[PDB]
Design a protein around this ligand. Structure first.
Ligand code: HEM
Ligand code: HEM
Lengths: 360, 360
């Protein structure tokens, strides 16, 4: 069933990346306390490893504060990530990937400290929110002594069983989101996602760019539907490129309209975001968020934009830079308010723990 | 797939009450603007009725800001409720039920204005959070001109398919929650829930007591495990009464231990909460909430306690008063921080609108 289903914890890679995105996610951003060094980090990651090892398979954690909430794992997964500040605290500043650093400033940025940065990431995904809540509590319980909570970001996708697996789901702007994306279990995916160069310990792992992007829905509603599709380069209902018919049709960036102007605008989102080389693409694995209203009924909603790639400098920044300097029409209705980066180590087997190659 | 499943909007009763509780809920508490009188309330409820009429069946609302999010309704339901202030503004004090008033003070209360009161309730329930978020957006769009958002309370239960329908689900304290409840499709349920006395307009309707109850999970983890079961009167895992073996075993309130003391404490939750007459019982239809963390790792979680009954004075207050005056052991780890009451009108058909019998 949806409840008894599990995702393996062990493997060459950490789960929660190639894993088809579950219905719910929480991104826990932690800062290290002063007394938390390499020794303490080792004890912590061993604690959290075994917690994930048990919980993801429906078994209570060690010293579980509520073991009856451990069953029904619902494809629970844990993904741990190390921020730039982690390495200095560990005395391993040399093994920090040179590419692992806070993203540079962009003109559209309205970043807030409460949604940015972080020394240690715990990404917990699950098809069930009760199972997720319990997993979060256990995580905090074992991380409490060594860290402070910098932020916690919750997001959702479709509930399990609403749409078939692999089918593209819509975001809170009504747009089909995830059409062009590296496919798990393919060569292009492995090259695009998993690290092969750089520091040894990170090989088999990846890097995460997590950006909290607010959807300016008040402005969005006042926009012209033709203008909305034009801004993206795809139709709302079908999800097809404006040059095409079906969702999976290849956009024609050389096509022009009756006026000789590009059908897909020069500053259309998918044009500026596109990279011709599949091996340089980023894995987008986003979650939607919707959190409360002002008295005048203005929404606080958007996207937890989670991008995974082997090299931030080669695979993310160039794209984000083109969106910014290219004057992406979508920037009129979206605003980055948070940004964090993490190095996600390789997976482990029954005889190890996440981050052993670094902290061991 | 389950996205296409719907619940009837039309009927003698509003949906979202007898309806088997969906995986997600938003309780939207609205305060009327100064100029919003009976005329304005009529226009508002006609707008909201039609929105629900279309959206619950997977059709876009009129002036829908994002029509592509209307399909796949996932058992979306709307339940509208009128607070005490609604009747004042509409000049229909004569039609206000005697019992429709803010609840009396209780010792355990730590109520906050930001979680209490409200003139107009829109209770939106759905098995899918994207569908839910869209429904909320449309509700606010048409309500903005007439009302201010007093509060929005988001809650969740198990995702669809995680547990078989009707099976008791656990709360964030790990406790099986919902064992003793009136059952739809029985005469006792109708007697307990649907109004058949008082002013004419409300017949076929019901009343809602909505209380935001914080869970003191800090103390809860520190609590003695045997004391936790003793506090409730049931075992954690099995859910059985301490006098029994299975969940649905009848609690024996006359039973004593070998020392001659009651097996179920005189101040046990279920003892103080129990009522002999099934027809006097309240319908409990709660949702769980989990909302963020302090720097030092303290959770902010609890229960959205939604109780439905034909008569607040006869079915809710007597129970709540016994829990308070009786010194319910569960009060050591639970704290009411919000309280609101609403009169829920009967259902409508085509050509009709919710609250028409009152406001029309
Ligand atoms: C912030 C809110 C955003 C929304 C609502 C959004 C929406 C979309 C949509 C509707 C598509 C077309 C369907 C698809 O291929 O997935 C798309 C494509 C894409 N987006 Fe975004 N996007 C957002 C931000 C970003 C950002 C910040 C990046 C940074 C890299 C990005 C990278 C991409 C890429 C690489 C594609 C693939 C385009 C292609 O090759 O055809 N998106 N996005
Ligand atoms: C966080 C707050 C609360 C929690 C965690 C909680 C938990 C529970 C549990 C575990 C049970 C036994 C299983 C069941 O029969 O559902 C129960 C029963 C019950 N509760 Fe509560 N409860 C809470 C607040 C309240 C409040 C404020 C009321 C006010 C009336 C209430 C009324 C009842 C009733 C009527 C029963 C049925 C007991 C019986 O007749 O055997 N509960 N509750």
């Amino acid at each position: 069933t949806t409840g008894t289903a599990t995702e393996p914890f062990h493997g060459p890679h950490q789960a929660g990346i190639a894993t088809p995105p579950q219905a719910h996610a929480v991104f826990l951003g932690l800062d290290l306390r002063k007394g938390t060094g390499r020794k303490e980090l080792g004890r912590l990651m061993r604690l959290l490893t075994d917690d994930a090892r048990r919980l993801t398979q429906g078994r209570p954690a060690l010293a579980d504060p509520e073991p009856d909430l451990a069953p029904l794992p619902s494809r629970l997964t844990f993904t741990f990530g190390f921020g730039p500040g982690l390495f200095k605290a560990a005395g391993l500043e040399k093994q920090r990937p040179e590419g692992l650093r806070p993203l540079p400033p962009f003109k559209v940025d309205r970043l807030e400290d409460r949604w940015s940065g972080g020394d240690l990431l715990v990404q917990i995904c699950c098809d069930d929110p009760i199972t997720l809540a319990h997993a979060l509590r256990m995580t905090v319980k074992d991380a409490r002594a060594f860290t402070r909570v910098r932020w916690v970001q919750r997001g959702f996708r479709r509930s399990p069983g609403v749409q078939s697996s692999g089918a593209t789901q819509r975001n809170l702007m009504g747009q089909l989101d995830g059409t062009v994306n590296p496919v798990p279990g393919t060569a292009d995916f492995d090259q695009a996602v998993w690290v092969q160069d750089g520091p040894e310990w990170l090989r088999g792992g990846t890097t995460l760019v997590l950006r909290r992007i607010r959807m300016e829905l008040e402005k969005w509603d006042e926009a012209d539907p033709a203008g909305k599709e034009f801004a993206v380069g795809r139709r709302l209902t079908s999800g097809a490129p404006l040059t095409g018919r079906h969702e999976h049709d290849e956009p024609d960036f050389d096509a022009v309209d009756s006026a000789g102007f590009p059908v897909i605008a020069e500053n259309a989102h998918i044009r500026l975001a596109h990279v011709d080389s599949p091996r340089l693409r980023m894995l987008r694995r986003p979650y939607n968020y919707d959190e409360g209203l002002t008295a005048d009924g203005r929404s606080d909603a958007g996207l937890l934009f989670a991008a995974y790639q082997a090299d931030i400098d080669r695979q993310f920044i160039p794209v984000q830079r083109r969106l910014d300097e290219g004057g992406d029409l979508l920037n009129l209705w979206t605003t980055p308010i948070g940004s964090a980066v993490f190095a996600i180590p390789p997976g482990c087997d029954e005889n190890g723990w996440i981050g052993q190659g670094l902290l061991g």
